[PDB]
Amino acid sequence: EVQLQQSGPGLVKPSQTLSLTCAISGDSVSSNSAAWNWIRQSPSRGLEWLGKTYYRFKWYSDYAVSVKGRITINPDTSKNQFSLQLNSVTPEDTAVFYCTRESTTYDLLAGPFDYWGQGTLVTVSSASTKGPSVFPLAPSSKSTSGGTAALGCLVKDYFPEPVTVSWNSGALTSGVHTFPAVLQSSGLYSLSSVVTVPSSSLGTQTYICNVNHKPSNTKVDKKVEPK
Amino acid sequence: GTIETTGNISAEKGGSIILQCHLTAQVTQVNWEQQDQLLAICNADLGWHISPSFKDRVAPGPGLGLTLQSLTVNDTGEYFCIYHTYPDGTYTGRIFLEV
Amino acid sequence: DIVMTQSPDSLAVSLGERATINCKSSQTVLYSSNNKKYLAWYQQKPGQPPNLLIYWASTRESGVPDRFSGSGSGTDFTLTISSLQAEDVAVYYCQQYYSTPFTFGPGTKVEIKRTVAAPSVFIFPPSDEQLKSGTASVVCLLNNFYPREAKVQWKVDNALQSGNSQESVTEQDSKDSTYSLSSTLTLSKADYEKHKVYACEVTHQGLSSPVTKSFNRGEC
């Protein structure tokens, strides 16, 4: 199978340029059976194609009219990857940017997007990065004896999105609910990550949420205990 | 080498125009171009393929030629028939269209 | 440009029952020379990229199960799920790859109709670590309920609160088809210390009367 790894910062100041890369594994950039596209997604505009680069017997590029003059998608044959450069970035460019492979095997100049990268959330803002403050959501002392109890972590006052939350270094996955973040009056994000566990295990089993905010290189481990 | 293009030709708006090119060596693929945009590909082993930007008004013409339908004032300019040959390499030809 | 439209905005179907979603292009995506329809279907589960399901209007992609199938032709297309599974809850898109720019539809959110499940309500006071920093967030959690419609009210000394709370909801669970919600009331340290009773009143279809979880500030 083909694997596409995305990299590059998410936070871009207005008027400055966004630069992302899509490293390819399992295929070549100069493939005659493929085109290398950039797609964006936002709740306002849905899914929108931005541009592509393909090599048949010469390198070609095709871009959307909504970004011509700002966008550049160039390949790198030695590093087996393709870039995206969006100049003069405005708050309207805030979106999840996906790199994807267009499978052009039957029709050499057209095909569907058969493989996609994980996506990069790009936030257009002048605000500086801020790591999260993690606080426990302790299980209640009035829990059901021989029932289930809820506990969690409040990941407050961070910017930009996203944060990742795991429990017991990724061992506890069952019954976990990491809610989507909300933008607060202050302009910083906040989310809760909860988990329902057996009430009888609160004395013996330890619970620790592991929060990673890659934009500011912050890693906070927080132990959630009763009382 | 051999570069034999149709020449600097013209046609009216709304109509169609045929783009001819003639080449000594094995032709692997012929790429048609509207200035810098790719119009069509005629691969020897995989056939004719039209760009999604031109499927609506470009059809394969006679031989390795092309037919540009529904002409507009924006179609004025240079047109190139790239000939990727083996072992001779690439040979290109220019055609100017006025409308 | 070719505009893509999808007739059902959202669709709720019981587990194991058929779900058919419609798509339409403003022009025919059928190319005569090869008799192919340049149309694709994608599935996008929350927080992950879209996955290709069908291409050429009816060809199933490798690895995608037999319950997904495509039909319809030229301009009107239809994606069918013969028996909808819990894991199939996602937004499904159609796309044309006929002319540049390649365009997508608005998407159709496919969800499951299931029995009414009442939430398990939990209230969490602010931690001493957070109060020390100068703020008090009180979190009320409604766990695994159905349908999504739920009203959560905050009361501080029996006074209804307004403008100082924010709520968040998870998308429908891929195994039990329920939702979860957290409502967070945020006060300053000084305000939190001015009041005693902090209550979260929850009204839901699965509850005969509202459930109130509350605590008194200071070890309760």
Structural write-up:
It is classed as immune system. The entry lists the keywords antibody TIGIT immunotherapy, immune system. Chain A has two domains: 122 residues, Sandwich (Immunoglobulin-like); 91 residues, Immunoglobulins (Immunoglobulin-like), CATH 2.60.40.10. Chain A is elongated, with a radius of gyration of 22 Å. Helix content of chain A is 0%, strand content 50%. Chain A is built from no helices and 20 strands. By secondary structure, chain B is mainly β. In chain B, 26% of the residues are buried. With 220 residues, chain C is mainly β. Chain C contains two helices and 20 strands. Chain C is elongated. Chains in contact: A-B, A-C, B-C. Chains A and B meet through loops of A and strand 5 and strand 6 of B.
Provide a concise account of the structure shown.
The complex is a heterotrimer of chains A (227), B (99) and C (220). Chain B is 0% helix and 54% strand.
* Total individual domains of chain A: 2
Strand fraction of chain A = over 45%
At CATH level 2, the architecture of chain B is Sandwich
Shape of chain B: globular
Q: Specify Rg of chain B, calculated over alpha carbons.
A: 13 Å
- CATH class division of the largest domain in chain A: Mainly Beta
Question: What structural class results from the helix and strand content of chain A?
Answer: mainly beta
User: What is the SS-derived class of chain B?
Assistant: mainly beta
Q: How many strand segments of chain B?
A: 12
CATH superfamily of chain B: Immunoglobulins
Order of helices and strands of chain B: EEEEEEEEEEEE
| Morphology call of chain A | elongated
Number of H/I helices of chain B? 0
CATH class group of chain B: Mainly Beta
The whole-angstrom Rg of chain A is 22 Å
Please provide the count of β strands of chain A: 20
Number of domains of chain B: 1
